[PDB]
Design a protein around this ligand. Structure first.
Ligand SMILES: [Cl-]
Ligand SMILES: [Fe+3]
Ligand SMILES: [Fe+3]
Ligand SMILES: [Fe+3]
Ligand SMILES: [Fe+3]
Ligand SMILES: [Mg+2]
Ligand SMILES: [Mg+2]
Ligand SMILES: [Mg+2]
Ligand SMILES: [Mg+2]
Ligand SMILES: [Mg+2]
Lengths: 336, 337, 338, 348
């Protein structure tokens, strides 16, 4: 009913990941940026605003969650936009129809909303960022930048599996400084992924408080970017694969009492509960905000697992695991 | 430490399933399971029971059985009637299936179920007579009667073959009179499925006093009263008989997102008043109330994908209910307008 | 057409209440209502019924009756036992109360309930024998037995030889009920968890005659002895329950339980005993929020003081509601477990 | 890192409230709280924060303030404007309430908030300038602007009751607004703007759906920042503005004088049909069949916007709908300070 551009951020606490829905006032068209596999929240919000999801875009090939972009194209018959700024080996493969490979300085329109594609390598070689201008409202200046894992609140992305990426990052940071200081920064990840809890920042504020914007010695920049960065959890290589090549469409599935106990098993209860009594061979991964961060070190994508917890707790963990592209929970068992 | 017993009723299907559990061993059985096993599983968990068995009274014509799903997903033993001819009996049964005969005994832990062949509604219909032997009972407690005996009425035979069924029903009623009048009657269907009671349970003695079928002593009169004025079966009944005899895909929930094309049979889930006040052309109003399945069954084409009209949540509920009659092919939805 | 029936079971109270409804008139009755009436109301609405009546089998010792709430909030007629002496009977009753006695008949639309005085558990205990006259039935269908007859056992003389007097009345009450048709159902007021109550929600008189000890013991002395002997001490909230059910308490309303602004001498930790062992705040009492929650907290609950709870917001909201079912509305706040 | 920040938006109220928290000390503050505090509490619990503070930007006209509930239920320190005259300020406030003035600093753990008096929408309106000092920041991050600055527009002076009317009221409020805008321009252009209201209300058609903006962006696109002629500014601000719905006048009084603590309550079937009654179903359901005398107020995003024109705070009211829908509507009405739903009837 209101004619102002629609914008809403969606945050997943386990993944520490931010996706966004933008929608055009005039035409009803809408786009999801960096979608997760479960599209239901975006859909319900679009319904409530009278918007139709017709587009989806992605900042880069994610290492820490399973993208829902192919699901958007297939289930919603939407046009999708992904980076074409890659070499022949590490670029997107098996993409559906309606897939547009975008390059630096390309413009994407979502109704009257204009997004300019900026190639911002460093975190990954194909990383792109999207500069939004609300042209439907007559704006002649940009409003904000969907920065993916290029720029975070109070930090910047690390080159994933380094000097080559670090050097790319330094250059991307130098060129992004040219954008107006009043633009908002809409990052792809936040606190828990260090990273700010505040879901958004501004370019000018980052220039004042983000170390990456004040360090102009390339060698010092590279050293600080790469130095003492923890080794990535084991599930990252698998995510890169499923995001580069695609996986099965997302569907919920039943998790009933386990038929075979000889499986890698994770106990979802509190550390206090587990400590108070637990079955042997099971690994305690409490289903709190650190669940994914912890479970990635033990999760084998080529094996079925059982979970220990009550039916409801198990169904929540099951869902969260599907968000990192794991659809193979074989069953569950109650704690004794 | 007493035998566990719990009835589960689906209001759209007007169907009753049960969970019984052994107090000594923890073994439990589901009788006449629907495709979504979650409610039985949740209750079993709460009571410290493990679902190790499931049984079915007959090849249902009004909902999609979850019996095969029990055997495959829970690795439980399943018990179905082996009292059939060579063409209408259960087919393609999965691992862990046991075909039972009249007088067989099934033990769920220390609970004993005696299988009674009670044909009429269908030629293979069986009823399960329960005795709480784990409590030391020397007498039966009740009968899981499926669609043989209801509260206040009895099942109708399917389509000649209608008269043969009528005669089998008369004979089954006569045989069941010998059981104690104090046993409970646990029917397979209730109010809304013929006119069944809302009360979920009866007793043989009370049925003998109030159920017309226990007072009609003449076969010709019994038959005429049974197979006269029988309404036409809804069109989904043949599909149900087929998927219950031969099987269908395992139950899984699925996503129903905004429809890409309007080119399908489309059901509007809103109230009849809302539909009257305003609707899209080319749709069929089937309000999502207790009569939802009874109504949609006339129109549902199992060979086609359909669209629904309603908000996201209303659509998700209707989708699930449709899966209970074995329909897994909703293509998408659209908002009312 | 022609009669609705539905049992409602609360797992913490191990208590069974029922809703019956006449489909001819739309009138409905709640038997042994708890304080929160929402479930009955929702079911009545789904069935096209209007709750116009409520009845209670006796003055309950193990939960807070919602009978007075039904009377005041739904302007319904309520029926309670008038089989009492001058001091232990209902007091302060609202003007839509009807006191019933042995052999009176209550009609819910066309449904007929005959009241039977079945003393023993309490001196005023009554049972309701239902006949579905709306469907032309000329025989009874079942008995709402309250705490007189349970599945596989019978109630004990409410500890108000004083128990000996109740046990003798129980013996005569059992004797008097044997005359009813063996095919009637038995719809008890409590089930598994309250000493030896069946999980199955209903039974039949003939089945109980075969399996329930009380029906086979015909020697009065022996019966009395087995009844009153080795009976566990009741938790302390039973006396509070008898008082609020006889005199009435405030109407039920939900209320907010936010983070505690101060500590309280009675602070109950709702987590599992294993979780409590693994770490807890001192000065607290562990009462896990499982099926034995009420049976445990009853020993410690002081109705004249405010209490605190330990657990997450949602766990706390659930326990708060369960405590309101035993007439406790004074939780002051909560704190997260540390 | 050193600071938690979360916005809470009520779609029916078109209202934005915020929770900020100091990760170093655990202290946390709610800005412009609604009456139901559960959402703030749940989020604080998840983050390991303790709600120790609450502040309010001004005397609200469009929802019922939870600020007194915060002080009473949570024993928190509360901060409200003392920039009012001796008659139009807050009354009946809990003991120890802090009446803040221009330039006062409020610390939430290591987070610093500077109170800025920004009159215009109301004479007492204040805005809060946040600096993340726990993270060592030397520059402000954002401004909690209430109804002073919106995304794409600015507040209009709240109207006065006919009985206590003053001839140049809309205009002297407009002048204050022009000066408040003038003063805010000196802040860094990269600060965020965190408004108290956004899209959804006919009384703010220009308000952004985006929950936040920046000062520099508003300087480029918000008319209020480019109009430097005072007379033209005043005229545009106060000319041809729609009449506010009737509940606004009542909300202002409830907020100025306080009301009973928030508590959920039961709404059960009612047989009394001699009450003002609202039918919560869709307009098409209502058209398909309804009872005469009832007023259709569909329980959609526009529920409050529409019901404000008919709600009588002095009467008990019935609702028509199913049990669950009635309970949702009942809760939403409590968010505008109405606790007197007497019961419901199912639709016929
Ligand atoms: Cl600039
Ligand atoms: Fe990344
Ligand atoms: Fe059948
Ligand atoms: Fe009792
Ligand atoms: Fe305001
Ligand atoms: Mg510049
Ligand atoms: Mg697998
Ligand atoms: Mg038409
Ligand atoms: Mg009256
Ligand atoms: Mg200790």
């Amino acid at each position: 009913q209101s004619n102002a551009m629609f914008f809403k951020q969606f945050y997943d606490k386990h993944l520490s990941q931010a996706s966004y829905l933008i929608g055009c006032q005039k035409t009803g068209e809408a786009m999801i940026i960096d979608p997760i596999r479960d599209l239901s929240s975006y859909i319900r919000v679009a319904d409530e605003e009278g918007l139709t999801i017709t587009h989806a875009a992605e900042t880069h090939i994610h290492a820490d969650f399973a993208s829902g972009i192919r699901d958007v194209a297939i289930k919603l018959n939407a046009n999708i936009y992904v980076s074409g700024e890659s070499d022949d080996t590490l670029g997107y493969k098996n993409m559906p129809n309606h897939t547009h490979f975008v390059q630096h300085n390309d413009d994407i329109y979502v109704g009257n909303i204009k997004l300019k594609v900026l190639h911002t390598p460093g975190h990954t070689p194909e990383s792109i960022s999207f500069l939004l201008t609300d042209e439907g409202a007559g704006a002649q200046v940009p409003m904000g930048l969907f920065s993916g894992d290029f720029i975070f609140v109070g930090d910047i992305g690390r080159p994933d599996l380094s000097e080559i990426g670090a050097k790319q990052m330094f250059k991307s940071i130098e060129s992004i400084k040219d954008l107006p200081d009043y633009i908002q920064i809409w990052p792809g990840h936040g606190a828990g992924s260090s990273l700010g809890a505040i879901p958004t920042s501004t370019l000018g504020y980052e220039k004042q408080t983000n170390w990456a914007f004040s360090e102009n010695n390339e060698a010092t920049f590279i050293d600080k970017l790469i130095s003492d960065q923890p080794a990535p959890p084991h599930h990252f290589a698998q995510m890169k694969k499923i995001n580069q090549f695609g996986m099965n469409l997302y569907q919920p599935y039943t998790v009933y009492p386990a038929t075979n106990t000889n499986r890698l098993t994770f106990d979802l209860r509190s550390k206090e509960a587990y400590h108070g009594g637990h079955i042997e061979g099971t690994i305690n991964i409490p289903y709190d905000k650190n669940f994914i961060n912890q479970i990635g070190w033990y999760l084998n994508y080529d094996q079925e697992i059982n979970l220990i917890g009550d039916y409801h707790l198990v169904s929540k963990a099951t869902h969260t695991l599907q968000l990192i592209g794991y659809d193979d929970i074989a069953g569950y068992q109650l704690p004794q």
